[PDB]
Symmetry: D2
Subunit: 192 residues, 4 copies
């Protein structure tokens, strides 16, 4: 499954709640915060359906997108809360030999080209894990794609630079809970 | 007109969201996920404080149904009043009325179909001489009355989930989804 | 008797409180989150004792709608994971079809117990199958007639509380915590 | 302020929502999940008042306590969301240079002996940040303490081994949302 597909055919900024200091820094809102949560909940169910059998090593990729790792884990925890079974789980943050013979879940916020995840997978596999599966919230339909496709995808978004929820721009838009396309005004205002 | 959901867009495939297993064959598509509703409802609260709130607000919920939306909408409204340095008094009430005279009356509805409910309701409310009468409807069914505040404009399909029910079923369904012919015959 | 708050709450400066309500409160008895956690368990106690026959949830007016909405949400949450289509009736009543029904009366606060005793007397003449009362708050008061609800959220001291579901002359609705009103705020918002 | 003080002098398990597979693994619930959130919300406000405004560096200490770090930041980001000002913020993790000239906030889940923090504070202060302040969800009231006190304290708990929310035990109890006292059955089952 390609996940929730958003074609090239989001929302107007006036239809949702937006921080006033970001009003001119955004073009449109692609994915409202609540829509992310609902999809993330289903993602957690998909993961726990196949991977959630026993002990899980959930790896968060750093840096950028910790909010998605936190929310995904909460939904996963909520499922364990009603499983009639005490299930242990390892939670760590990649940027070692603990992964050997484990069910590893790599969690990423966004995959653009796919170079990051391809490098990361070719390194985790250098050890001896039972299996490595990757769950990503966002996946760009970009011509810059190397070809990689995650095992779990939340949203498939157009090839536009997005901010909000878990994605920041020079450590801005962290208080922005919606996934939104940055504008040239915001891109320039928050330049490093 | 609010968040428009056109006829040509299919909505959301049931495979993409969390749905009660007992409602699996009873739904066709998910139009509006629960989180989408809350986000839109949050903005609607801001729109209410924009045009209203200059005077004492009387929040009117209409029975039956839509109490869930009335509850959520007021929560966002009360949240806006929390960040104010002024203690805002607000009156809540439920109808099928002397309290309305000289007040800003907000009639909260979950869905508008034929529009006959609101037309009959408006006329009676403005008889009691309010300072302002406005209507907040979560859903407007594309089936000559237009609300002041609209959450979503949905196609002509019988929807259930979130505040909306069918023979008191689908109350546990948090998403606004289109009912199927199976579910229609099932819970008739 | 549910969570017991003895005569022996919290300081206002330890929680998130509306600045305009600073002088109007003495103490915070029950933070909003603590209400939610207890309400969640209450909903399970209801399903374990009333989830046998179709439930007619009756909300008592005025006040207590917020507790009614939250209680139902946790109830509906249990129905989602039941793998069964469970129909539920919701309705409202005031200071005044139920025959052979499993009726759940939802109240926010029981003080003297006169309201519920009167209500229960009225409902039982329609001859329902079962009547049970779930109250969020129950006061330890000498003015109590002796009535005890089937489901209790919190047993609180004999103090006039506001917040969450309880208002005072249409004030304190934005207050999410159950808190004791002060003489300052009570005289400030008097009608 | 010493934070919300829980005396040695908690809540019964039968009053709150608790997973069935942890039933015999717990003695008593000290802090329900919702109570934590209400307190964490106030802490975030204290933080933003005192060290907020401009740029801060949020450091989470590994391992454990990521949950409290996530929730505290959510409340912080909620504050910045309604501030009418674009506030930048660094989020980072560290396990025992960018910090220099910045407002460093160390976020801990629990402080017991205080050996972890005094060591951590000494290292961070070497890089001459503009200031270093520490927010701990739980401060364990114990004579084993070195005498260190955080700038921000959520709860001052008795000297009992607690699990839940952000405190795990051999990677168990991660699904437990309430801070509860572990039993001997659970301390041996998850050995
Ligand atoms: N804020 C923001 N950052 C982005 C975006 N696209 C790429 N990046 C850069 C980083 C952010 O984590 O991701 C690259 C993943 P890779 O191309 O597969 O190696 C974007 O739309 N928004
Ligand atoms: N569950 C469900 N109920 C509906 C729907 N359309 C109409 N109704 C009937 C009721 C529901 O509250 O509303 C009527 C509004 P009116 O025709 O303008 O007076 C629908 O799509 N779903
Ligand atoms: N806001 C507020 N109102 C209260 C309180 N105690 C009593 N009341 C009045 C009403 C309910 O609002 O109590 C009637 C229940 P009964 O005495 O058992 O018949 C209180 O602490 N706060
Ligand atoms: N699950 C649990 N773990 C604890 C507890 N007390 C200490 N620890 C261990 C670790 C944190 O997990 O404490 C280090 C802080 P320091 O002792 O001040 O240097 C406790 O009550 N529960
Ligand atoms: Mg990332
Ligand atoms: Mg209606
Ligand atoms: Mg009442
Ligand atoms: Mg720690």
């Amino acid at each position: 499954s390609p996940g929730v597909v958003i074609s090239d055919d989001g929302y107007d900024l006036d239809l949702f709640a937006i921080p006033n200091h970001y009003a001119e820094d955004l073009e449109r809102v692609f994915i409202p915060h609540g829509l992310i949560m609902d999809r993330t909940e289903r993602l957690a169910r998909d993961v726990m359906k196949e991977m959630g059998g026993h002990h899980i090593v959930a790896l968060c990729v750093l840096k950028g997108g910790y909010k998605f790792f936190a929310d995904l884990l909460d939904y996963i925890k909520a499922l364990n809360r009603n499983s009639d079974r005490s299930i242990p789980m390892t939670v760590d943050f990649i940027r070692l030999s603990t992964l050997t013979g484990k069910n590893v879940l790599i969690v990423e916020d966004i995959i653009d080209t796919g170079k990051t995840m391809q490098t990361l997978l070719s390194l985790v596999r250098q050890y001896n894990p039972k299996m490595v599966k990757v769950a990503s919230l966002l996946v760009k339909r970009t011509p810059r794609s190397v070809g990689y496709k995650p095992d779990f995808v939340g949203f498939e978004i157009p090839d536009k630079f997005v901010v909000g929820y878990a994605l920041d721009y020079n450590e801005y838009f962290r208080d922005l809970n919606h996934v939104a396309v940055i504008s040239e005004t915001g891109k320039a205002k928050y330049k490093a």
